[PDB]
Amino acid sequence: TPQAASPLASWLSYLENLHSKTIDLGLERVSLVAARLGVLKPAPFVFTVAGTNGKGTTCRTLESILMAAGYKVGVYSSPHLVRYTERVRVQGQELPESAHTASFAEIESARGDISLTYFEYGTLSALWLFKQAQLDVVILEVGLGGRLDATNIVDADVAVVTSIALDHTDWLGPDRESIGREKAGIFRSEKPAIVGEPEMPSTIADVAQEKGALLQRRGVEWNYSVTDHDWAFSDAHGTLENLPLPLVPQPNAATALAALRASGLEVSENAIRDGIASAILPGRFQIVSESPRVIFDVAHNPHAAEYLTGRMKALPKNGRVLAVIGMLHDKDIAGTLAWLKSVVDDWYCAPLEGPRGATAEQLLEHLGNGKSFDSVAQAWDAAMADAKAEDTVLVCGSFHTVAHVMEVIDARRS
Ligand SMILES: Nc1nc2ncc(CNc3ccc(C(=O)OP(=O)(O)O)cc3)nc2c(=O)[nH]1
Ligand SMILES: Nc1ncnc2c1ncn2[C@@H]1O[C@H](COP(=O)(O)OP(=O)(O)O)[C@@H](O)[C@H]1O
Ligand SMILES: [Mg+2]
Ligand SMILES: [Mg+2]
Numbered sequence: 579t580p581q582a583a584s585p586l587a588s589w590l591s592y593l594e595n596l597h598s599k600t601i602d603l604g605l606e607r608v609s610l611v612a613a614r615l616g617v618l619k620p621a622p623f624v625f626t627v628a629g630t631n632g633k634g635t636t637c638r639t640l641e642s643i644l645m646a647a648g649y650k651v652g653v654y655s656s657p658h659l660v661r662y663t664e665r666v667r668v669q670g671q672e673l674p675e676s677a678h679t680a681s682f683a684e685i686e687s688a689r690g691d692i693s694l695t696y697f698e699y700g701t702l703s704a705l706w707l708f709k710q711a712q713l714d715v716v717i718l719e720v721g722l723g724g725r726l727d728a729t730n731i732v733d734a735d736v737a738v739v740t741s742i743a744l745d746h747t748d749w750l751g752p753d754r755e756s757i758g759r760e761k762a763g764i765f766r767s768e769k770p771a772i773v774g775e776p777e778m779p780s781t782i783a784d785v786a787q788e789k790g791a792l793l794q795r796r797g798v799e800w801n802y803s804v805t806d807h808d809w810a811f812s813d814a815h816g817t818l819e820n821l822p823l824p825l826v827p828q829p830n831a832a833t834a835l836a837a838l839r840a841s842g843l844e845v846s847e848n849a850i851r852d853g854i855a856s857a858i859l860p861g862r863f864q865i866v867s868e869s870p871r872v873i874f875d876v877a878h879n880p881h882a883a884e885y886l887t888g889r890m891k892a893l894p895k896n897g898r899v900l901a902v903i904g905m906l907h908d909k910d911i912a913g914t915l916a917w918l919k920s921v922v923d924d925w926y927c928a929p930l931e932g933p934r935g936a937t938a939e940q941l942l943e944h945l946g947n948g949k950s951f952d953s954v955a956q957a958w959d960a961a962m963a964d965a966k967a968e969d970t971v972l973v974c975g976s977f978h979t980v981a982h983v984m985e986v987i988d989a990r991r992s
Contacts, residue, residue, distance in 0.1 A: 582683035629740025639834030643853025725763020743881030774833030880913035897968035904979035
């Protein structure tokens with residue numbers, strides 16, 4: 579059993595093995611420990627963000643605007659690209675590793691004999707770190723689903739649903755309706771329930787009615803329009819024009835703005851512009867370099883692949899598209915690749931080290947074309963060796979693939 583003085587790495591290895599099951603959805607055990615720790619209300623204002631895709635970037639947008647508005651903001655995000663500490667930001671910055679291990683030590687003593695999973699532990703830690711930080715606003719990214727996610731032990735002041743599509747059917751049910759119901763579990767009585775999914779499953783309205791939540795959805799209570807050079811937003815309180823084209827997915831920037839406006843928080847139009855203009859998240863349609871155009875995107879399900887495919891087709895015409903890909907077997911690899919195949923010319927497949935990582939040959943079979951490599955680094959090197967300046971190299975499929983290339987590039991700078 580690690581202690582406050584133990585390295586973070588030891589703590590993470592310990593958390594990875596503490597509970598009988600890796601993922602164990604449910605609120606009881608975790609709520610009881612949160613109750614002992616006094617971390618159930620981490621800040622006077624909390625945004626909780628659920629959805630199939632778009633959670634990370636919607637949270638980043640909220641963080642960016644609120645910081646511009648001068649609020650002390652904390653953000654809980656998952657999963658992480660390279661380092662675990664990425665999961666907890668205060669004022670847009672990671673916290674010291676020793677703050678994390680101290681928090682873990684507090685949870686370890688407070689839990690007594692109550693067992694907690696890795697994500698439950700990490701959630702309690704983020705909450706405790708936020709409480710210590712005396713923040714004005716805390717933004718919680720839901721881990722998985724909503725209703726039974728560890729983050730749902732906190733009562734959000736504004737609940738957000740970014741999109742509803744097929745992912746995590748093992749836990750959330752086989753269709754958009756079952757998935758929508760689970761995501762909507764973060765809604766609360768008399769609190770805004772901001773829905774950015776344009777094709778809202780009816781179950782989301784059911785849950786909003788069951789809870790007495792204040793549903794405000796895209797296409798109804800609020801909306802946005804786009805141009806090649808900017809965008810506009812509208813809701814019950816008015817309209818905003820010539821907004822900065824987002825550096826995060828367009829739908830999420832609009833969802834964040836809707837949630838921000840529904841919150842009643844005091845935020846100027848300039849803080850909104852500055853926030854949107856500066857909101858960006860590594861690995862989310864990230865333009866890394868040019869000649870050739872290098873793009874990183876963590877899409878890992880067909881809805882995200884379809885969106886990515888749409889962004890790829892919107893890129894300047896000409897040149898070849900070479901993809902460096904690695905994926906986990908727990909995702910709909912076939913459906914994800916079906917979309918990507920329509921835009922990719924040359925495939926460079928790599929295995930993902932793992933209990934759940936697909937091998938290069940497994941990916942190759944889905945493609946019907948392409949080359950296999952022994953590692954992401956080698957696939958990346960082969961693509962970049964083949965790419966001409968007019969081409970685009972897309973690193974995709976998983977957080978793992980993107981992270982591997984980010985690390986190879988950074989290491990080469992030394
Ligand atoms: N009550 C609990 N909730 C909970 N929620 C999530 C998890 C596992 N951690 C995850 C983190 C991220 C994702 C994910 O898909 O993240 P993105 O969609 O943003 O990419 C899934 C699981 N365990 C428990 C768990 O064990 N208990
Ligand atoms: N509204 C959206 N619709 C479809 N796909 C999206 C949307 N937002 C993001 N994505 C996809 O999901 C990936 C990660 O997005 P992120 O904003 O971190 O959301 P999440 O935390 O839910 O995974 C992106 O790189 C993109 O491939
Ligand atoms: Mg997910
Ligand atoms: Mg996320």
